[PDB]
Every structure is written in structure tokens, then in C-alpha cells.
Structure 1
């Protein structure tokens, strides 16, 4: 049903972080009652089932939800629908839970005949890679508040990190729709030369020099140097946002 995009099947596995701990010791001991525990349980279950149904039915979503139940989530649908509903899910969970419970997800791209058992297993281990996220290896236990985006090693977050990646994605989508339609061939050049930076650095600074060299009447070099500015501090962020932009805008 998509016109510009990719022919991949995206899935979502959202698991609330430390819900079992939120039941063991999350609720205050002084405010401990059977009615209050039942209220919290029913609120969470109603949230998941009912509000997932209503949130998808609010407007046209290409999602074919497999399971909501409780504390878990499975979804299969259009790849871009999975990506743009992950943010909706995180913001709705934050609003309903008042930013008290963390959630983790995992998204995988699959063909039209990929093994669905393999789909689920890969999405589960990506979910675990999102569950075991720690900015620093000093504090006990994991933050658990992360999302893996198509790879177990690509553990991004939902915080200001995801804010940055989505701001970058929106900016790139707005800017790079209308190039000269001929100089855009440098995009794959950048992608394949930034795939990993632990090796010959000569070509990276060479591409920087080439971008500086490119001089005509265009948007200018404001964003053409913002690419360089974002090409050093944010390496994995730039490659992830750029790959998301490419997959969204690929003429496939």
C-alpha cells in the first residue's frame, strides 16, 4: 500500500521494564491494599488491550497487532508504520503512567517469506539487547530504558538521544528531498565510508574536503557544513538517522 518506501516487514516487541519490581516494591508499603493493587493491575491491563485498540483505531494505521495482553506487545505491519508508532507508543505510555515505568522495544526488518519463528526470536534478542542497556558500566543493574533498531548492537534510547535522532531524521527529510537530483550520489558514498570509523580515516577527511569544494548556487553551505558538524560528535547517531531516512525515502 506504500508508494515510496521499502519492501520489508517491521515488527515491535514492547515490554514494560521493572513491572514485576513495580509490584514487589514499587507501590508504597503504607499505601498497600487489595483494592489499590487490583486498581493498578486493571488499569495496566485496560491500558494495554483497550487503549492499544483505540489508539490504532483513532486514525489509519497499517498495523495488524498480534498480542497486547499485559506487560508485553507484539505488532506486525508496515515498516514506516512500526517506526512512527513506536514514538506514539512511548509518548502514550509516558502520559498514562506519568513517566514512572520504563519501556523497551525492538524492531526488525524481514522479507515477505522470512520464518516467523525466526522473526520472533530475532526480535526477542533485539529486545533483550534493548533491556540490557547501560550508558556507563559502573552502576548496578541495567537502565532497561532503550530500543534496538534493526540490530542488537544498535541500542538507542527513548530520551534526548531519540529526540536527537528524530530531529535529525525530520531535518534530513525536509532538506534532502529536493537536491540537484544529480549530486545526491554522494549519499551512498557517505554511508559506505561511515559504516564504521576505526580504519583508514583518509577518505573521511577527503569527503569533507570534497563537500567543502562543492561550490555552486544552492541552499549554500549552511547545512552542507552542518553535515560535517554532525559527522564527528554523532557518528552512530548520524548513520542511524541517515539509514532511517534512506529507507523511508528509497524509491522502492
Structure 2
């Protein structure tokens, strides 16, 4: 890879409540050993065979360690892993036609990072995604989520795809003609957005000033769009901005 940060991507996906589906997912009337075997074979053949075939469809830079049953462990270029996470979610949702959900954790590590710690950390992220519960009123976690590089960046799959990826696409399409001072301006935007929690007024003013400085190579309309996002959807905006910085980092790859 030529553009991005020289980082390995570790993906760990797991179907939510597959054991519950095997216990009581099938209605009691349609319970037989043949139906149970059909469901088991569907799941197993999907994971093993179809993950192989789907990753062979386009030359993803992935190095699948294990697919097996209900689980997944793949290591590759972090951009390819991030791109294939949504493809995996969509293909699983098609295959099950939205009867089972999948949780994933995506870790980002350097090449010489310990493999034991890669596995442990990405498992922790996958557990955090399985801990996803948007409202503290329901019973049992929603579990249909993905964790992005850190246990604080747990987003649902719909949230991830729609919000984060449309924001990342807009940022990419509006930030490609920035200067090398613009990169530092994006860094400052990220720092200000992270600090907004402990600085309500001065920090939003500083963000407005930074957008003012930027709105000469990005346009006034997108500066206003970023300002609106910062006051409405901040954590998604921070996620998209960090992903853009890591994807466009010119420190080899």
C-alpha cells in the first residue's frame, strides 16, 4: 500500500446470540434434526467457504487466520480490513436476511506489535462491540455494533456505515486540495473536538476560527457543514476525521 499509515488491521467478528438461535430461534413446531442440521450447515458453510470466496472476489490484502464457526480472525492492511468489515456485515445480513446480527472489533497495530496482544486487544474491542447498548433501559445488549481501534469508539453497524462513512467521503472529497498547513488544521480540529467536553464556549469558538482559516481551500459551505456536525454529531465527526488523517498520512505505508 502506498497511501495511509503503516499499520496492521486485525478484524474479529462474531455472530450475536447464535446459541440463543440454536436453542429457541427455530419455532417449536418446525423442530427436527434435519432442520437443525440445515441451519448448522448454512452457518458453517457461510463462514468458511463464503469468506474464502468473498475475499477472493477482489484482491483484499487480508490474511485470514481463522473463520471456522460463528467467529472470524483476519489480519491485513488496516484500510482493507476496514473496507471489508462493512462488506462482511452486508453479506452476512444478506445471507441470514437480517435474522442474525454480527459484532466486530477492528484493531490497528504496527507490524512488530506482539501477536498475543493484537489478539487480546482485538478480542477486547469485539467484546466492547458486543456490550453495545444505546439505551440503559432495555434488557440485554443490542450487540449489532463494531468497535473502531479502541473500546470508546463503539458504533452500531448502521451508525458506522451511514454516519461515519458519508462523513469520511465528504471529508475526502473536500480535503484533497488542502496544503500541508491544512493537515495541521485538521489535527487542531480533532484536538478541539476532543476537548469540547471540558471547554463549552472557548473551544467551539476556536473551532469556528479554525474552520474560518480552512474555508479558503475547502469552501464556505463545507466549513458550515463541519460546524453543524461538530455541534450535532461530534463523536462520529471525530471518528471520521481521525480515519481521514490515518488514511491520508504521508509517512510511507
TM-score scaled to structure 2, two decimals? 0.94
8 Å Cα contact 1:9/1:111 also seen in 2: yes
8 Å Cα contact 2:185/2:214 also seen in 1: no
Partners in 2 of 1:231 and 1:170 — Cα distance?
16
8 Å Cα contact 1:193/1:203 also seen in 2: no
Q: Which moved more, 1:218-227 or 1:52-61?
A: 218-227
Deviation at 1:81, TM superposition (A): 0.5
Partners in 1 of 2:250 and 2:200 — Cα distance?
31
Q: Structure 2: state its 5+ residue gaps.
A: none
Structure with greater helix share of residues = 2
Partners in 2 of 1:51 and 1:215 — Cα distance?
45
Secondary structure, counterpart of 2:71 in structure 1: coil
Q: 1:191-244: per-residue Cα shift (whole Å, max 9, x none)?
A: 112223221334423324424644986553100111101011111111001101
Q: 1:81 to 1:218 in 2, by over 3 A?
A: closer
RMSD of aligned alpha carbons: 1.7
Aligned residue pair count: 251
Q: 1:130-189: per-residue Cα shift (whole Å, max 9, x none)?
A: 101111111111111111111112111102453111111111111111125544431111
Partners in 2 of 1:219 and 1:194 — Cα distance?
19
Q: 1:37 to 1:190 in 2, by over 3 A?
A: same
Identify the residue that residue 204 of structure 2 maps to in structure 1. 205
Q: Structure 1: state its 5+ residue gaps.
A: none
Identify the residue that residue 169 of structure 1 maps to in structure 2. 168
Secondary structure, counterpart of 2:129 in structure 1: helix
Q: 1:77-117: per-residue Cα shift (whole Å, max 9, x none)?
A: 00101100001000000110001101000011112111111
Q: 1:11 to 1:213 in 2, by over 3 A?
A: closer
